[PDB]
Coordinates of C-alpha atoms and ligand atoms in Angstrom, one line a residue:
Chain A
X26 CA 108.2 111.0 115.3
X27 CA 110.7 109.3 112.7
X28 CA 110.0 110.9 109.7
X29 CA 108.0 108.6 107.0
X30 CA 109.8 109.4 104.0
X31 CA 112.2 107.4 106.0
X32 CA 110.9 104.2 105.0
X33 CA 110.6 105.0 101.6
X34 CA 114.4 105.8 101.2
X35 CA 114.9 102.8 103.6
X36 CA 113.4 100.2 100.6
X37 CA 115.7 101.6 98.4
X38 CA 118.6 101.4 100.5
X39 CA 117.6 97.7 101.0
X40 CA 116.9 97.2 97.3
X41 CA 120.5 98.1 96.7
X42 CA 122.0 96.0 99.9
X43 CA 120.1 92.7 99.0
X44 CA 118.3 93.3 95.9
X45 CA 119.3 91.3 92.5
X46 CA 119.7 91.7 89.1
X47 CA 116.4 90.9 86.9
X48 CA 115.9 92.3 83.2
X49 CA 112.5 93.5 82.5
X50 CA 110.1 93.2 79.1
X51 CA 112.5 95.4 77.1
X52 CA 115.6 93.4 78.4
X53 CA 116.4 96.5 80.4
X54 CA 118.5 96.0 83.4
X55 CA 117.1 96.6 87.0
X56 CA 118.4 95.7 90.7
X57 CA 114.9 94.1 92.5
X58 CA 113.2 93.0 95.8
X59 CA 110.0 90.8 95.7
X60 CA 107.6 91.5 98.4
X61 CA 108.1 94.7 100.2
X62 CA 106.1 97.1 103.0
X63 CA 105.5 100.6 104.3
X64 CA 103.6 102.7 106.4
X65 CA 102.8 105.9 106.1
X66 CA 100.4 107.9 108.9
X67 CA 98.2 110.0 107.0
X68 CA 97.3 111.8 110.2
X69 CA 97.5 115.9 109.6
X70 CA 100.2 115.0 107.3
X71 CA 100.3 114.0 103.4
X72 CA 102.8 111.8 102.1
X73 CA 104.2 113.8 98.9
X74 CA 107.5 112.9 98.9
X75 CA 110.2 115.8 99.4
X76 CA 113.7 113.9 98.3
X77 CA 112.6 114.7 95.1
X78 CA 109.1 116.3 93.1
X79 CA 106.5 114.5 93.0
X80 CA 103.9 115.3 89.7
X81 CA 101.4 116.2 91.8
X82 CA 99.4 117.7 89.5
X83 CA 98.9 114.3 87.7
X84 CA 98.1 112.6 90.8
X85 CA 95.4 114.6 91.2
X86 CA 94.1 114.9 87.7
X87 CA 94.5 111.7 86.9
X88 CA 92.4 110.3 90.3
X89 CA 89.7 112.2 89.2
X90 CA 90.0 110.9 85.8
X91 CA 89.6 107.6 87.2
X92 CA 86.7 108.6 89.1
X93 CA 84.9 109.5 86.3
X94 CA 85.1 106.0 84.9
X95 CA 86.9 107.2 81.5
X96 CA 89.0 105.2 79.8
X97 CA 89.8 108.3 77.1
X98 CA 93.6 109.0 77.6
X99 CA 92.6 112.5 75.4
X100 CA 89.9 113.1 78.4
X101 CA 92.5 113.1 80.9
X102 CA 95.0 114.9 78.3
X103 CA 92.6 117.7 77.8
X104 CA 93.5 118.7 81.7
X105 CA 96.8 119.1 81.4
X106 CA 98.4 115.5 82.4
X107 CA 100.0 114.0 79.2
X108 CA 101.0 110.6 81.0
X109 CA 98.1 108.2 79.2
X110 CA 98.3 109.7 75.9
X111 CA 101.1 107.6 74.3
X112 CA 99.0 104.2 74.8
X113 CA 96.2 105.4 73.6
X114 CA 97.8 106.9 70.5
X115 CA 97.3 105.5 66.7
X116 CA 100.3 103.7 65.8
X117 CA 100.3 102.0 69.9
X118 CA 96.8 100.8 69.1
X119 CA 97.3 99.2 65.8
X120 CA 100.2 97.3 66.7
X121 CA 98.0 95.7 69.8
X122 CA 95.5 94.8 67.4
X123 CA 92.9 97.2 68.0
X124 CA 92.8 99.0 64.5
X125 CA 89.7 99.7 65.0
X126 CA 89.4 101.2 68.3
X127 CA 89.2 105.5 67.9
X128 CA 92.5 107.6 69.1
X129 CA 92.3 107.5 73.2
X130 CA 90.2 104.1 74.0
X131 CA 92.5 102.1 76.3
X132 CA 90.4 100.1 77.1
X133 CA 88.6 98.6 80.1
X134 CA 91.1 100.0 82.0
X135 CA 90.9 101.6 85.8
X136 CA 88.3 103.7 85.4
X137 CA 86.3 101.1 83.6
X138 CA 87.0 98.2 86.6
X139 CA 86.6 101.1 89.0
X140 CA 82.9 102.1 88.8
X141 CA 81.8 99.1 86.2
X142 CA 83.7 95.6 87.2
X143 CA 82.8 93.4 84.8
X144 CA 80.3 94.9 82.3
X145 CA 81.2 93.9 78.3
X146 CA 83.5 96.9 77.6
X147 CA 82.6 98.1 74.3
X148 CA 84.0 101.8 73.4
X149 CA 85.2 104.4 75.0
X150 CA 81.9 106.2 74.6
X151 CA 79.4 103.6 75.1
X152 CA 76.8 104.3 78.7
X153 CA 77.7 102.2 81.1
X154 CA 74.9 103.4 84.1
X155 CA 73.9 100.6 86.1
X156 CA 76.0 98.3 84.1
X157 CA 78.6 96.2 86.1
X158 CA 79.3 96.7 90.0
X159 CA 80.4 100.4 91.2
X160 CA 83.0 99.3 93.4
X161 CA 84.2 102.6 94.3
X162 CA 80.1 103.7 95.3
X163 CA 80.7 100.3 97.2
X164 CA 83.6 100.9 99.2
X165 CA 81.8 104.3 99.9
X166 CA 78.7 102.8 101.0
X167 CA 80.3 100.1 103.6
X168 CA 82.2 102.1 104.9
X169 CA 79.6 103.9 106.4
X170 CA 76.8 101.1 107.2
X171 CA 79.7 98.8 108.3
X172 CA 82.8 100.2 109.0
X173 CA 84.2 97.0 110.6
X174 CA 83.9 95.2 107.6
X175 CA 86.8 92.9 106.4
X176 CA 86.2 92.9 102.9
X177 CA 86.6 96.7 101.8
X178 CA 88.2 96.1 98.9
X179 CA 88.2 97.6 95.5
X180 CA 90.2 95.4 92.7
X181 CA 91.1 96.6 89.2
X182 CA 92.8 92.9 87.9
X183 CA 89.9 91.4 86.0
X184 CA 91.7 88.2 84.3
X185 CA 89.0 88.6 81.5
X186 CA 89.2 92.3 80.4
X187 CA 93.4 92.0 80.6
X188 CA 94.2 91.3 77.0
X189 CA 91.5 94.1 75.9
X190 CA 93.5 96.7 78.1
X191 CA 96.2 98.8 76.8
X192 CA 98.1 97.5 79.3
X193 CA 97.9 95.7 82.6
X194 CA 97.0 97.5 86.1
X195 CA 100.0 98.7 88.2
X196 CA 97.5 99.0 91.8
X197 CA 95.6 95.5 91.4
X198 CA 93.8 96.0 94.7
X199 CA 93.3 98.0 97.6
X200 CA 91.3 97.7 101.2
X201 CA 89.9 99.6 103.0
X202 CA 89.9 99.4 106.7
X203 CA 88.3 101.3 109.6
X204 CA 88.8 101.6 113.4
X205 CA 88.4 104.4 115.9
X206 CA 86.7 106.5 113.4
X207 CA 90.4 106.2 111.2
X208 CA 90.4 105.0 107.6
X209 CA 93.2 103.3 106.3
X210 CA 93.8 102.2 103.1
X211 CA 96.7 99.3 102.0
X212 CA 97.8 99.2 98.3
X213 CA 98.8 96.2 96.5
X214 CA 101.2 97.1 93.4
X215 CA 102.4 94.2 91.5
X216 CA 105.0 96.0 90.4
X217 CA 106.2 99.5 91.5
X218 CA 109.5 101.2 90.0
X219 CA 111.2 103.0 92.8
X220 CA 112.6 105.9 91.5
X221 CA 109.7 107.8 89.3
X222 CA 106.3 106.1 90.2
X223 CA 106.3 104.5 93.4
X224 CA 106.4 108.2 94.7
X225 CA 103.2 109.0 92.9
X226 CA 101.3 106.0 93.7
X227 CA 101.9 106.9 97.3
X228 CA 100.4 110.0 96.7
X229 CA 96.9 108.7 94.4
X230 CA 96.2 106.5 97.2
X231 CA 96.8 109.1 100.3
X232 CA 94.8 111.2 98.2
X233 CA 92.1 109.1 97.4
X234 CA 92.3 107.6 100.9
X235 CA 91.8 111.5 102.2
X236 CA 88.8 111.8 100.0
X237 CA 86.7 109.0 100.9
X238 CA 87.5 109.7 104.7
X239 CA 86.2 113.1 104.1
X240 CA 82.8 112.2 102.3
X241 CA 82.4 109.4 104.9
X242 CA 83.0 111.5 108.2
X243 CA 86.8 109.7 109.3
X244 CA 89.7 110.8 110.1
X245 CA 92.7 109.3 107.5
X246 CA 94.2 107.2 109.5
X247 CA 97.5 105.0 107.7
X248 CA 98.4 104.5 104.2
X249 CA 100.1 100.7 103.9
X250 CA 101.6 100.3 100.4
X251 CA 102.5 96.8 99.4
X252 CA 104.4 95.7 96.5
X253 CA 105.4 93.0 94.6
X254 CA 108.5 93.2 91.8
X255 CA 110.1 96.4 93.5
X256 CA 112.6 97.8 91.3
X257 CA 115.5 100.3 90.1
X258 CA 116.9 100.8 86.9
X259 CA 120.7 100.0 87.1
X260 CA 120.9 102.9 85.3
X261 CA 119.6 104.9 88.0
X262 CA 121.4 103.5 90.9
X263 CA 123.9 106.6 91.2
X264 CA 121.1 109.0 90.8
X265 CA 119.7 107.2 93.6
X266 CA 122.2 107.5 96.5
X267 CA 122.8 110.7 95.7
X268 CA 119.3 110.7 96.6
X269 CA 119.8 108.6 99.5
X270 CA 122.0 110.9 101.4
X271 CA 118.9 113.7 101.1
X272 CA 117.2 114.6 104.4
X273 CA 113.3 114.3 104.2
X274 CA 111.6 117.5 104.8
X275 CA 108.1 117.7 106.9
X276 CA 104.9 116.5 104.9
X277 CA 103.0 118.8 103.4
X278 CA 99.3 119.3 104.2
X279 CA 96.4 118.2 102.1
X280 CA 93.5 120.6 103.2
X281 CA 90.1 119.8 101.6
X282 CA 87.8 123.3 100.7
X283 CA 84.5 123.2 100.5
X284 CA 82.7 120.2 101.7
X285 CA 82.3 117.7 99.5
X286 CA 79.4 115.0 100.4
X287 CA 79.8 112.7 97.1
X288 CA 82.4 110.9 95.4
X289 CA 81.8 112.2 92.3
X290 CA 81.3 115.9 93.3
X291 CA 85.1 116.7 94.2
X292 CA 86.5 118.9 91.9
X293 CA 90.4 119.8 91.3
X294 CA 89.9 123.3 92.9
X295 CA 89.1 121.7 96.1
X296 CA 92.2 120.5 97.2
X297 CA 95.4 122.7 98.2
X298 CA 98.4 121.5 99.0
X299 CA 100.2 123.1 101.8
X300 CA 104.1 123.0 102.8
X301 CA 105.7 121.1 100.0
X302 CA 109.2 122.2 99.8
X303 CA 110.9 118.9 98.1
X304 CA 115.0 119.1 97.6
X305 CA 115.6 120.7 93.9
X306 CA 117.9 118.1 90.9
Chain B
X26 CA 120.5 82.9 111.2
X27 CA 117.0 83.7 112.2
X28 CA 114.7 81.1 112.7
X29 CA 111.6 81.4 110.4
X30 CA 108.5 81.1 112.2
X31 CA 109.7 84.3 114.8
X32 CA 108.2 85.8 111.8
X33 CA 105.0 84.3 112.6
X34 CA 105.6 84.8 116.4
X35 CA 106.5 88.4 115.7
X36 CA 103.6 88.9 114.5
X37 CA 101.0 87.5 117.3
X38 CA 103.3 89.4 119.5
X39 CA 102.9 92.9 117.8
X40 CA 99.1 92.3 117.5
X41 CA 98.9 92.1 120.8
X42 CA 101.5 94.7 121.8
X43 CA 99.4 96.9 119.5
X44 CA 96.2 95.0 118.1
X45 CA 93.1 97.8 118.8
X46 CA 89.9 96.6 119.6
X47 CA 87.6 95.9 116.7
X48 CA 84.4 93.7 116.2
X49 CA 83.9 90.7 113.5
X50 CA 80.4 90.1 112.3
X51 CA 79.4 88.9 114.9
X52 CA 81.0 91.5 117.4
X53 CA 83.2 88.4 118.8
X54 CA 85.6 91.2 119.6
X55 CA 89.2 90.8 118.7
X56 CA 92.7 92.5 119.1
X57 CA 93.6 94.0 115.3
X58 CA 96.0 95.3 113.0
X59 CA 95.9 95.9 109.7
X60 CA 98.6 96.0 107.1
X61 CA 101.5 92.8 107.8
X62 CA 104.4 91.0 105.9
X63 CA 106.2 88.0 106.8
X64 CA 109.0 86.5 104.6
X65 CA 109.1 82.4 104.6
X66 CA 112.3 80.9 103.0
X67 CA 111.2 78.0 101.0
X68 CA 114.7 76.9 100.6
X69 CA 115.5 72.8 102.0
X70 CA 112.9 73.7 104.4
X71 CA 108.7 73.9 104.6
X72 CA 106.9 76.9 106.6
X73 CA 104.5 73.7 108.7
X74 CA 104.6 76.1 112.1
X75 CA 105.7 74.1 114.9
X76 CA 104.8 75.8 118.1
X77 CA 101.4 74.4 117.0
X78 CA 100.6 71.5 114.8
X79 CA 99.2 72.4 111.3
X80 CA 96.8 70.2 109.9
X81 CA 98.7 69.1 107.1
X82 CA 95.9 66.3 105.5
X83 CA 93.9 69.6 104.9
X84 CA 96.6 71.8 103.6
X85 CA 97.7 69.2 101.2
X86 CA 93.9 68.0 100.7
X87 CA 92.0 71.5 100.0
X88 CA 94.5 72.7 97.7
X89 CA 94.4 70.0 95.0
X90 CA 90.3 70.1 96.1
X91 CA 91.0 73.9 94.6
X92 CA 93.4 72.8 91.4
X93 CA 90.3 70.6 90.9
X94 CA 88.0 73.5 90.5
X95 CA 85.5 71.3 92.8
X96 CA 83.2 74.0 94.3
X97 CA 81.3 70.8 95.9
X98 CA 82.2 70.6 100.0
X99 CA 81.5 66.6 100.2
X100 CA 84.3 66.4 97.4
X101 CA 86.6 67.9 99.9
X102 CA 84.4 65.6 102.6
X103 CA 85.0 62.8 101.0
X104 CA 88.8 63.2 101.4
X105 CA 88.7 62.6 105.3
X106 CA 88.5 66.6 105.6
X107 CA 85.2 68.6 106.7
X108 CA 86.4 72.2 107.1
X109 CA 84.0 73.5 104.3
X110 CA 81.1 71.5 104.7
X111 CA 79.6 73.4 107.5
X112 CA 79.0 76.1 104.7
X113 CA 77.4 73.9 102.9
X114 CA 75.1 72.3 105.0
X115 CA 71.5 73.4 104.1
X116 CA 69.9 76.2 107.0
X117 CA 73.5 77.9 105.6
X118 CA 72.6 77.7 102.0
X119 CA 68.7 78.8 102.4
X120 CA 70.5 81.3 105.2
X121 CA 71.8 83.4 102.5
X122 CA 68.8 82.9 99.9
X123 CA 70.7 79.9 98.6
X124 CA 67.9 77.6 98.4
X125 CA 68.0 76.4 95.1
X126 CA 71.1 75.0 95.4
X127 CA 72.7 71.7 96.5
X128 CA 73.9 70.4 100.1
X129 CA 77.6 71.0 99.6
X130 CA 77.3 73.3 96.3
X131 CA 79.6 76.4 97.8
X132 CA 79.1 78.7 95.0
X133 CA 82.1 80.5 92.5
X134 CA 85.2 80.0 95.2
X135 CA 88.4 79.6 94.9
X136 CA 88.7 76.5 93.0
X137 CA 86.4 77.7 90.1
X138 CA 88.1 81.4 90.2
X139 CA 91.4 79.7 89.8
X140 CA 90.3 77.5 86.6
X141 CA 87.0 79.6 85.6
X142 CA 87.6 83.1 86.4
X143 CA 84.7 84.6 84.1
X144 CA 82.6 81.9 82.9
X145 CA 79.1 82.2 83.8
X146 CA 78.2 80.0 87.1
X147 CA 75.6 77.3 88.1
X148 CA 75.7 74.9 90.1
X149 CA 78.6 72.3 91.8
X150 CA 78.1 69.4 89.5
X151 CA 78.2 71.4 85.5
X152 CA 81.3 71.4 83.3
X153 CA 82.8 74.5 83.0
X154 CA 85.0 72.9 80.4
X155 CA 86.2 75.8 78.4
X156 CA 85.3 78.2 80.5
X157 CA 86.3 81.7 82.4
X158 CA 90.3 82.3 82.5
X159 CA 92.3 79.3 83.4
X160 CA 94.8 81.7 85.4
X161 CA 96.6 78.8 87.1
X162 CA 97.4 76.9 83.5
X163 CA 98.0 80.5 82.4
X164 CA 100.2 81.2 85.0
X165 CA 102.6 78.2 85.0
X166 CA 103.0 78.5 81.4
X167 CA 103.9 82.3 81.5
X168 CA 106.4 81.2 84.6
X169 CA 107.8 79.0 81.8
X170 CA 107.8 81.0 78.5
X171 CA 108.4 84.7 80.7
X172 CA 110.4 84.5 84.0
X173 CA 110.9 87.9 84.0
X174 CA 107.0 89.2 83.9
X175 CA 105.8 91.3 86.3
X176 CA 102.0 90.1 86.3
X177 CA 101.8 86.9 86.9
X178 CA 99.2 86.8 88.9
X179 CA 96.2 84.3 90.1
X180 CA 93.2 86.5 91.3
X181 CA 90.2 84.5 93.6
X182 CA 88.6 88.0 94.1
X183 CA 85.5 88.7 91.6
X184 CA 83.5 91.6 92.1
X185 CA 80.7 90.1 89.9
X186 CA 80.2 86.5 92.0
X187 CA 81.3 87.6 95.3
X188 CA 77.4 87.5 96.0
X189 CA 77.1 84.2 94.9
X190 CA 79.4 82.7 97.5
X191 CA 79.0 81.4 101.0
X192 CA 81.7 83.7 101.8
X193 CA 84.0 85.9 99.8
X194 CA 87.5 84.5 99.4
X195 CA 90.2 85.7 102.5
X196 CA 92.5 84.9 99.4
X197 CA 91.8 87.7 97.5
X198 CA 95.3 87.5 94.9
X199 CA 98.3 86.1 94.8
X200 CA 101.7 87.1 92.6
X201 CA 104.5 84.4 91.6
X202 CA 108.0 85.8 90.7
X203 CA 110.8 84.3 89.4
X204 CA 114.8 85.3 89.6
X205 CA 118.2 83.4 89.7
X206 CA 115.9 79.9 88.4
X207 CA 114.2 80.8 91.9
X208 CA 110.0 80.9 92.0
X209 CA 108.7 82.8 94.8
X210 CA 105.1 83.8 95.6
X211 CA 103.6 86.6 97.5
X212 CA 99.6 86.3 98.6
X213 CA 97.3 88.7 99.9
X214 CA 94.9 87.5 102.7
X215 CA 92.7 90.2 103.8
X216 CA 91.6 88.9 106.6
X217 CA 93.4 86.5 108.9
X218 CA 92.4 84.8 112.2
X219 CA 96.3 84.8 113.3
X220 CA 95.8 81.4 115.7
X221 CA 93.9 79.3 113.4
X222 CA 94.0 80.4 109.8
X223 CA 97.1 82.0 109.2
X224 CA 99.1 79.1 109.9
X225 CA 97.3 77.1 107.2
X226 CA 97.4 79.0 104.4
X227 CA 101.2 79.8 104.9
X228 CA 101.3 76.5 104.4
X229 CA 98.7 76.0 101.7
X230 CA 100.4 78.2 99.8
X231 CA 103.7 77.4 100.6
X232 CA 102.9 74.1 99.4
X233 CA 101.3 75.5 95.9
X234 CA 104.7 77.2 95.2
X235 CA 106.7 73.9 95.6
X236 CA 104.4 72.4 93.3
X237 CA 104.4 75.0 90.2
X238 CA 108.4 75.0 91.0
X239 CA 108.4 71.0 90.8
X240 CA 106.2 71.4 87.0
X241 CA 108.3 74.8 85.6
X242 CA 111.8 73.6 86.9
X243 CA 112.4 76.2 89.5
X244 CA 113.6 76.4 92.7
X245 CA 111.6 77.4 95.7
X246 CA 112.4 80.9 97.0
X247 CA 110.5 82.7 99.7
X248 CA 106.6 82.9 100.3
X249 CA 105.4 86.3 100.9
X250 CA 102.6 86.7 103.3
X251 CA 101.2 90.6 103.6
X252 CA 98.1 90.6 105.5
X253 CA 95.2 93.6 105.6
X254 CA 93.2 93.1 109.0
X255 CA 95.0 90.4 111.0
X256 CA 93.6 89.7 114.1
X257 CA 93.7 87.6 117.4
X258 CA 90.2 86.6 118.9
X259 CA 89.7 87.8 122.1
X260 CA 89.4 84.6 123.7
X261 CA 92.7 83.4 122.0
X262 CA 94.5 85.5 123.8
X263 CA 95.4 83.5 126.6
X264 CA 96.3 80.0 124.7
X265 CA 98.2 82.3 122.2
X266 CA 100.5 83.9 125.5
X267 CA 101.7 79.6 126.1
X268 CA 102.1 79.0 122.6
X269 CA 103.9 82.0 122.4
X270 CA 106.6 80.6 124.3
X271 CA 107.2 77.5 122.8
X272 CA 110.3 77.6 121.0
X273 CA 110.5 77.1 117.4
X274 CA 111.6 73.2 115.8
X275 CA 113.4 73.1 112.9
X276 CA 111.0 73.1 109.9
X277 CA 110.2 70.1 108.2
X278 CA 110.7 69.2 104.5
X279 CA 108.3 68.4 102.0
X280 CA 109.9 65.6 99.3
X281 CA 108.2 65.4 95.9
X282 CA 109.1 61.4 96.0
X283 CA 107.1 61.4 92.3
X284 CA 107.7 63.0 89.1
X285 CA 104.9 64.9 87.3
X286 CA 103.9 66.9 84.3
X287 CA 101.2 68.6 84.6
X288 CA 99.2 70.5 87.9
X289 CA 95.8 68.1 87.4
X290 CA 98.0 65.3 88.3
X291 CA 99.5 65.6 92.1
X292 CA 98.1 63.5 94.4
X293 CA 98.4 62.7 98.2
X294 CA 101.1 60.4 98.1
X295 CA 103.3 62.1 96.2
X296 CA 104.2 64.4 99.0
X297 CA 106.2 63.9 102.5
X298 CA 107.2 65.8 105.6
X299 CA 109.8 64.8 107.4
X300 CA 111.8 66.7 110.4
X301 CA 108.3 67.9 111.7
X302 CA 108.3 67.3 115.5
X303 CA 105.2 69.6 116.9
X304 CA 105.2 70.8 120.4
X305 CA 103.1 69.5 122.7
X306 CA 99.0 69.2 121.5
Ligands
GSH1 N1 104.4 97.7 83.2 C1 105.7 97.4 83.7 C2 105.8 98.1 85.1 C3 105.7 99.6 84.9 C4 105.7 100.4 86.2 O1 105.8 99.8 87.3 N2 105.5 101.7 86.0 C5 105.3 102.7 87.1 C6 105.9 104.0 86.6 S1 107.8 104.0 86.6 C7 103.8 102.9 87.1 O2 103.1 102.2 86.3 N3 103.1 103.7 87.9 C8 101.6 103.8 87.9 C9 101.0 104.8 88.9 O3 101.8 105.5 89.6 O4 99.8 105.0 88.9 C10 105.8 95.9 83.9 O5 105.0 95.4 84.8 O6 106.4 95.3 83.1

C-alpha cells in the first residue's frame, strides 16, 4: 500500500531531475515538465495532502461556489475564501476593458460553463434557468442511466466566452468514469503550479468526485489528475526539497453527514474531514 | 535508450494485465482502464507503430480533411479514404433523427470545431466564412507571438453541438507547448479502441505537430498521449497477444520535401516516410 502522496512528491522530484527552465506571463522564472500523470485511490481515503496544508476550507467553499453557477467573486468572498476577489476587483476590471461590469462579475467563468455551457453571458445577476446545457445535472444524470458511458465529461474551455472571462480555466475538462459500481474521475489542468495549487486541485476534484458518487449510489473509486505545463517557481526550488525529504502521513477521511440526494442540496456542514495531521512550516 | 513504441506496447500489456470488464454501447464487452499517458519523442523520428501497419493515406488524408473544416464524408471519400462515410450513409443520418440532412453531411465535428468553434451550424456545404473561433489560426499565431503561454489550446469538445453530431469527438482537446525552440503537444482522447484507433491518432497527431512546427519555426518535441477509458475489445485479445510480440522497427521519418506558409496549404505530396518497414500483414 505505497502511500499516494508519493506520486505527488515523485512529479516534483522529476520536475527537478529533468524539468527545464521556461519564464511565464510575468517573465518570472520556473523549472517545467509538459505532460504529466497521477493516481490517487479515493477508496476510504481522501487525498488532502499532509507534506504541507492544504486550504481546505477554500476547496470546499469554493466547489460549492461553483456549484451554484455564480460567477460573483464577493458571493464566494462573503464565506470566508478571499481567493477570487482580486480579479474581480475595480481597478482589475477596468484595465481588461470591462469598465462597465459591477465589482465581483468575472465573468462566464466555471460556474457559468458549469451549469450553463454556452448561453450569452450577460451579468453576474442575469437568470440563467434553462438557459445553456447543465453539464454538471448531465454528468449526474448519466451516470446513473448509463454508467458505462464513454463520454462523461464536463468541460469549462469555451473558445468563445475566453476573452469575456477574467481569466482563463486552470481544470479545462474532466471525465467521468464508472465500473464495478466505482466512480472515477481524471482531471485535465492545462497548467498546474506544483507547489501551492496543484495540492488543492487534487483536493476539488476528490471532493467533487466524493459528492457525485454519493448522490449517485457509487463507491469513489480513483482520482487521475492530468496536466499539461507542470511547474515550480525557481524561487521555490529549496523550499521544495526541504519538502521532499517530508514523509507523507495517512490520508485523512472525507465522511459525508446527512444524506444528500441532489447536487445542489449539499451544504458545507455536511462534510467533516477526519485525520488530517499535515507536517507544520 | 528505450525504444518508443514499448510505450504503446506497455500499454496493451497493462490493459490486459489489469483491464476490468466493461460494456460499449453495444455491450461488445471489452478489457478497460481508464486514465493513460504515453510520451512519443518527435525528435528525427515519426511515432507510424510498426508491430502493425498504420494506415498512413488516412492519417495524412483526414487531417488536412479537418484543417479543411470539410464536415462532408465524400470530401474525405473522394480522397481514396472511406473511414467516415459509413456515418454518413443515410439509415445512419435518419437513425439519429438526422433526416434532413445530406448523404455525407456529418454534423459540427472536428474540422468545423477546429475553424468554427461557435458559429451557428447547418449543413456540409454553407460558408462559415467568418465564423465561430478559428482556434487552429489562433493557435499557431499565439505559438508565434507567445511561446511561453500556458493555454494554447484547440478544443473539438462543444457541449452545445455534441447533439448535432453522428458521434461526439474521441478528441475532446488538445494542448501545444513550446520550450528550448521545441513545440510539443499533448491530446486528450477519451475513449480509445487500443488495436485500431489509438495507433492512428498518435500518428494523426503526431503528424499535426510537425506541421504547426514546419509553419512557426519550431522543432518537434514529444507528443503526449493521456487517455480516459482505453480499452481492448474482447475479441482483440488474441490477435493483440502475436502482435504483442513483434518486436519494434526503427520508426520512420516524415520529410517536409516542400516549403510552406500557411496551414490551408499542405498537401499530400509534400510529406514522406521513409525507414518504415511494418511487420508482417
Ligand atoms: N494562469 C497561469 C497559471 C496559474 C496557475 O496554474 N495557478 C494555480 C495556483 S498556483 C491555479 O490556478 N489553481 C486553480 C485551482 O486550484 O483551482 C497561466 O496559465 O499563465
Amino acid at each position: 500500500p505505497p502511500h499516494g502522496e508519493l506520486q505527488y512528491l515523485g512529479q516534483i522530484q522529476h520536475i527537478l531531475r529533468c524539468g527545464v527552465r521556461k519564464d511565464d506571463r510575468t517573465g518570472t522564472g520556473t523549472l517545467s515538465v509538459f505532460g504529466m500523470q497521477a493516481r490517487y485511490s479515493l477508496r476510504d481515503e481522501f487525498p488532502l495532502l499532509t507534506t504541507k496544508r492544504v486550504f481546505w476550507k477554500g476547496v470546499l467553499e469554493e466547489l460549492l461556489w461553483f456549484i451554484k453557477g455564480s460567477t460573483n467573486a464577493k458571493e464566494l468572498s462573503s464565506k470566508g475564501v478571499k481567493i477570487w476577489d482580486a480579479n474581480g476587483s475595480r481597478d482589475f476590471l477596468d484595465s481588461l476593458g470591462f469598465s462597465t461590469r459591477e465589482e465581483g462579475d468575472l465573468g462566464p467563468v466555471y460556474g457559468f460553463q458549469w451549469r450553463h455551457f454556452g448561453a450569452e453571458y450577460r451579468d453576474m445577476e442575469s437568470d440563467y434557468s434553462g438557459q445553456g446545457v447543465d453539464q454538471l445535472q448531465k454528468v449526474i444524470d448519466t451516470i446513473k442511466t448509463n454508467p458505462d458511458d464513454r463520454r462523461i465529461i464536463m468541460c469549462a474551455w469555451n473558445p468563445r466566452d475566453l476573452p469575456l472571462m477574467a481569466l482563463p480555466p486552470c481544470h479545462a475538462l474532466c471525465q467521468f468514469y464508472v465500473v464495478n459500481s466505482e466512480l472515477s474521475c481524471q482531471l485535465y489542468q492545462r497548467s498546474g503550479d506544483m507547489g501551492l495549487g496543484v495540492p488543492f486541485n487534487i483536493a476539488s476534484y476528490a471532493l467533487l468526485t466524493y459528492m457525485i458518487a454519493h448522490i449517485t449510489g457509487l463507491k469513489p473509486g480513483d482520482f487521475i489528475h492530468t496536466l499539461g505545463d507542470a511547474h515550480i517557481y525557481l524561487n521555490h526550488i529549496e523550499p521544495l526539497k526541504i519538502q521532499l525529504q517530508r514523509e507523507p502521513r495517512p490520508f485523512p477521511k472525507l465522511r459525508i453527514l446527512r444524506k444528500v440526494e441532489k447536487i445542489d442540496d449539499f451544504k458545507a456542514e455536511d462534510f467533516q474531514i477526519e485525520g488530517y495531521n499535515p507536517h507544520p512550516t
